[PDB]
Amino acid sequence: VPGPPTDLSVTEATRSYVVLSWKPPGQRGHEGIMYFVEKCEAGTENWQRVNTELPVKSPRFALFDLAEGKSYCFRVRCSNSAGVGEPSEATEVTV
Amino acid sequence: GIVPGPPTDLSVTEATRSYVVLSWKPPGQEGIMYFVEKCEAGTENWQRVNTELPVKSPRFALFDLAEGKSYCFRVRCSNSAGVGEPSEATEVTV
């Protein structure tokens, strides 16, 4: 049996969690689908992709510790081997 | 090939709350995993913090602890042999 852990420390911080969710399209393409999430600040008009470690294979996504007091818009597009499709309608959230 | 259509019905929910981060040092003791235990500041009712994945690293975090409540935490190490004795507890107020 192992020994006990030591120097256990617990700290507390206020953070933000944003959860996105959507339905897949009716026109799914010739094969399986993959999702790419894009982000844009309320001020700018600059849509930037949220790059990921893993392919977003489920129609849901989450973001941790977005800047507090800032407002964002999000939109999702689908990707095949054929190409990247047109974006969804955007939805706004304030952190 | 045929490019897919656009997703629909995008919806977003957001929560700002207190985020609790734990960290500890491994004991002087093959593959090991950790079991986290929780109890309110009245340190009587120790409950195991169940996880979706085994805790293989000396760190853990929780994002939805009850605000305004005080908790105590303690960690145990686990081998293929068994589960060892717990660490000293540490308190946090969220």
Curated annotation (Swiss-Prot), chain A:
Residues 4-95 form the Fibronectin type-III domain. It comes from the Eukaryota. It is found in: Cytoplasm, Myofibril, Sarcomere, M line. Homodimer. Interacts with TTN/titin. Interacts with PNKD. Major component of the vertebrate myofibrillar M band. Binds myosin, titin, and light meromyosin. This binding is dose dependent. This is Myomesin-1. The lineage of its organism: Eukaryota, Metazoa, Chordata, Craniata, Vertebrata.
